[PDB]
Each structure stands twice: as C-alpha cells, then as structure tokens.
Amino acid sequence: MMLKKNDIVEVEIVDLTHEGAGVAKVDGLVFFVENALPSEKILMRVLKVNKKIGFGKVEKYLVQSPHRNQDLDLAYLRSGIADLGHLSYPEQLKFKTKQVKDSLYKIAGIADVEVAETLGMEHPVKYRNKAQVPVRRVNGVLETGFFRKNSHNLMPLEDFFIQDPVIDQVVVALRDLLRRFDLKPYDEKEQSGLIRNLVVRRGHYSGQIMVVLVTTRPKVFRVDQLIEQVIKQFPEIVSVMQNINDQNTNAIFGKEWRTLYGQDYITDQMLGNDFQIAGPAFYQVNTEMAEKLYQTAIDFAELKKDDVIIDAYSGIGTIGLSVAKHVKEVYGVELIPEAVENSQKNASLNKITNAHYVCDTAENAMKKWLKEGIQPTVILVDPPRKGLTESFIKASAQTGADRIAYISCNVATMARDIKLYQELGYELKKVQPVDLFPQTHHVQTVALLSKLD
RNA sequence: AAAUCCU
Numbered sequence: 001m002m003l004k005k006n007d008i009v010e011v012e013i014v015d016l017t018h019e020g021a022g023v024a025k026v027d028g029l030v031f032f033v034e035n036a037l038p039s040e041k042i043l044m045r046v047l048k049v050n051k052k053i054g055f056g057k058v059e060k061y062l063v064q065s066p067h068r069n070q071d072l073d074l075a076y077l078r079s080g081i082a083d084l085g086h087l088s089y090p091e092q093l094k095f096k097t098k099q100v101k102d103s104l105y106k107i108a109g110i111a112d113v114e115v116a117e118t119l120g121m122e123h124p125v126k127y128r129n130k131a132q133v134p135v136r137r138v139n140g141v142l143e144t145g146f147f148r149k150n151s152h153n154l155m156p157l158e159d160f161f162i163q164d165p166v167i168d169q170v171v172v173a174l175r176d177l178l179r180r181f182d183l184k185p186y187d188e189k190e191q192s193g194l195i196r197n198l199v200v201r202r203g204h205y206s207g208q209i210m211v212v213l214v215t216t217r218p219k220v221f222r223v224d225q226l227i228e229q230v231i232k233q234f235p236e237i238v239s240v241m242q243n244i245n246d247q248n249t250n251a252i253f254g255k256e257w258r259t260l261y262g263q264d265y266i267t268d269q270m271l272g273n274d275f276q277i278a279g280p281a282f283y284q285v286n287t288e289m290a291e292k293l294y295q296t297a298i299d300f301a302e303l304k305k306d307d308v309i310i311d312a313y314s315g316i317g318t319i320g321l322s323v324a325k326h327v328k329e330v331y332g333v334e335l336i337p338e339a340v341e342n343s344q345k346n347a348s349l350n351k352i353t354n355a356h357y358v359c360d361t362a363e364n365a366m367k368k369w370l371k372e373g374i375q376p377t378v379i380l381v382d383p384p385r386k387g388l389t390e391s392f393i394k395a396s397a398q399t400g401a402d403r404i405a406y407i408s409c410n411v412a413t414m415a416r417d418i419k420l421y422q423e424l425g426y427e428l429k430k431v432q433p434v435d436l437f438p439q440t441h442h443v444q445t446v447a448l449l450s451k452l453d
Numbered sequence: 454a455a456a457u458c459c460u
C-alpha cells in the first residue's frame with residue numbers, strides 16, 4: 001500500500017524514541033506518534049508521509065498501556081515541559097536505563113559494561129530550582145506559562161508540577177503585578193512589547209530567591225514600585241536582576257545584565273559547603289539528585305590525599321570545591337566570567353586555598369596545563385549537551401591521567417566521546433544513570449573511564 | 454544547538 005496525509009490506519013507501538021515519541025512500522029515506514037507508549041493499539045492519523053520515516057497522531061485508543069498515567073494535569077504538560085509524564089515513574093527509570101545501554105551500543109560499540117539501574121527520586125515532583133517562564137498576550141490578557149513543543153504558542157499555567165511550589169507562587173505573583181502595572185508583554189511576531197521572559201532561581205536548602213526580568217528595552221516603567229511589592233510577598237528575594245535582549249531569537253538572555261535590587265547573586269548549599277550563584281551562571285536544576293550525582297562521581301574517582309584533580313567545565317565550582325579538602329590540588333576551567341568569578345569566591349568562602357581556576361574554553365586550558373607541566377591524576381568533566389571536542393579528549397589523554405569521570409546530560413555525545421577515549425587507551429569501567437530530570441526524556445549519567453598500562 | 458517546553 002501507499003499511505004498519505006489524513007489516512008487513519010491501525011498500528012501497534014513497539015518502541016520509544018529517545019525524546020519520548022512512540023515508534024511504529026507500517027509498509028517500510030517508521031512512524032513517530034506523539035503520546036503513544038509501547039504495546040498500545042491505536043488508530044493512527046497520518047500527518048506527514050516522508051521517504052523513509054513518517055509522523056502520526058493518535059486518532060483513537062483501542063488498547064492503552066498498563067504503564068500509562070491517566071493524570072489529567074500531567075496530560076496538559078505532555079507536549080511541553082513534562083514529555084514523559086504520561087509514562088509511569090518506574091518505567092521512566094527503566095526507559096532511561098535502556099537509553100544509556102542502547103546508545104553505548106549503537107554509538108560506542110559497547111555491549112559488556114555495567115550500566116546499573118537509574119537512581120530515581122522517592123517523590124519525583126516539585127524539584128526544579130530554576131524556572132524560565134515566557135510572558136505573552138493570550139486572548140487580550142498577559143499570561144505566564146509554557147510553550148508547546150515545536151512552537152512559541154504560550155499555554156497559560158500556574159501549577160508547573162515539576163517546579164518548586166514557591167517559584168510557582170512567585171511567577172504567578174509577578175504575572176499579577178505585570179497586569180496591575182500595565183507593562184506590555186512581548187509580541188514575537190509583531191516585534192512589540194517589553195516583558196519577554198521571567199527567570200526565577202531559588203535555593204534548594206537556603207530558599208534565597210533571584211528574579212530576572214528579561215526585556216527588549218533597558219527602561220522598565222515603574223519597576224522600583226513593582227520590585228517593592230514582591231519583597232512584601234516574598235522577603236526571601238535577595239536580588240532582582242534585569243537582562244536586556246533586543247534581538248529576535250529563541251535564546252533567552254542577551255548581553256547586558258543589570259542589578260535592579262539587592263545582591264547580584266543568591267547563596268545555596270551543596271553537600272557540606274555553600275555556593276554563591278549569579279544570574280547568568282549555571283546551577284544544577286535538581287540539587288537533591290545532583291548531590292547524589294556528585295557523590296557517585298566522587299566514589300567512582302576513588303580520591304586520595306596526594307591526587308591532583310581537574311574539574312573541567314567548572315561552573316561555580318561545585319564538584320571541585322566538594323573534593324578540594326580531600327585532595328592536594330584542584331584545577332578548574334569555565335568559559336563564562338560570572339560563573340568562574342563565583343567559583344573563585346566560593347573557594348574563599350569555604351576556606352579552600354588550593355582551588356585554582358581559569359577563564360577560558362576547556363580545550364584551551366587543557367593545552368596550557370599539558371604544556372606548562374601539570375600532572376593531573378583525575379579528570380572530572382561536566383560539559384553541556386554538545387559534549388567534549390576532539391582537542392580536549394586528545395589533550396586530556398596526553399596528560400597521563402589515571403581516571404576520568406564523565407558527567408553528562410546527553411548520552412549521545414557522551415557515547416561519541418567515550419568511543420574516542422577507548423581509541424586512546426581508556427577502558428570504560430562503570431556507568432551510573434541518575435534521574436535529575438523526572439517526568440522528562442532527559443538522562444543524567446556518570447561514567448568512570450580508567451587507563452590501561 | 455542554546456537552555457524542563459523554548460520549531
């Protein structure tokens with residue numbers, strides 16, 4: 001047969017993609033059906049027929065999965081912020097464990113290495129310490145909410161499910177004040193309006209709140225009066241920042257940062273020590289599981305008093321300063337000035353005078369450290385989704401480091417980079433996934449690579 | 454490809 005647009009066909013889902021979309025096969029075409037779990041009988045409406053693949057919609061459910069979550073509140077967030085909410089939490093952990101095993105095989109050619117089960121939350125809800133929230137006009141009303149997948153169409157929402165309840169109350173309180181003061185929301189198509197987004201970071205243990213008003217222009221009309229109101233409702237707001245982003249882009253922040261009130265940072269704890277976090281600086285969104293993520297990497301590293309650690313992709317120096325008292329030297333690198341400046345202050349704040357940072361790209365610092373004659377025994381790395389470059393992997397091999405711990409939020413690039421480490425004499429010993437992002441497709445992973453000879 | 458969604 002020859003399928004085409006708006007044809008209803010009975011199919012069976014036999015797999016999930018890494019992003020969470022159901023996979024079905026009909027006449028040599030791999031169809032990707034949204035909101036469809038494995039072993040489900042459905043009438044699939046064909047959306048777009050392609051050369052080798054296809055795309056579909058569930059027109060009717062004939063048989064649903066035993067592992068389906070019927071929660072109506074999570075179903076609203078499926079095409080968006082909680083794209084594995086419709087799968088039950090035990091199976092999310094099995095799914096993410098499978099993704100690490102499948103990716104290490106398909107990319108790296110590895111089938112005989114320990115990938116233990118994913119360490120999940122006891123209560124997998126209300127976890128995010130940061131929350132980026134766009135502001136838009138919906139039916140002539142200023143609304144805070146979330147975009148649907150593959151769009152900038154704002155779905156208004158108050159209860160975010162996966163975010164801190166206090167952050168939800170702050171963004172709802174900010175929404176009301178933007179309505180009250182009559183500040184115009186940013187229209188993306190028209191290129192009109194002031195208030196683009198709202199970023200609200202809140203410490204997991206401390207509870208100290210930052211607010212960032214992302215805007216098109218520098219001038220915000222009656223902002224000091226608007227700031228004065230949120231302090232009465234939420235005294236824990238130690239800082240209110242302003243970011244200016246005049247360009248038309250999917251990216252949130254522009255260049256110019258300003259301090260409208262109080263500090264230019266919040267303070268929050270991880271493990272024993274305290275850490276100052278700036279607005280543009282990175283902070284692990286799930287502090288509870290990030291502590292378990294670090295403690296896995298720290299135990300995997302098998303640290304000694306005479307070890308020399310490299311914490312590449314430092315951020316605010318959470319991993320490095322957590323182990324600096326238990327080792328001889330700690331060397332870190334971080335591209336963003338605001339993050340590495342926190343990192344230096346965090347070392348001083350916790351009486352750590354052996355944490356030596358540099359502001360550069362990771363590959364550049366490794367070339368310098370290799371040239372100037374540093375002798376690192378352990379290499380801890382925690383890059384973004386894109387992962388490591390070939391320069392860094394080759395340079396880090398030439399240092400003659402005993403162990404390398406790879407923390408990642410994208411197994412695809414991790415499996416690619418591990419494949420190159422195997423070519424330069426580093427065997428992959430252990431792997432341990434940790435669920436930093438419940439109710440979503442994203443998988444955090446730690447991986448001990450140990451050297452031969 | 455840049456951060457939970459944010460083509």
Ligand SMILES: Nc1ncnc2c1ncn2[C@@H]1O[C@H](CSCC[C@H](N)C(=O)O)[C@@H](O)[C@H]1O
Pocket residue numbers: 281282283284313314315316317318319333334335336339360361362363382383384
């Ligand atoms: N080429 C590069 N070299 C070094 N750092 C980079 C980089 N590209 C991005 N980064 C930075 O690396 C950081 C990754 S997140 C840092 C994780 C941190 N150690 C923690 O666990 O808290 C970000 O702050 C990002 O700005």
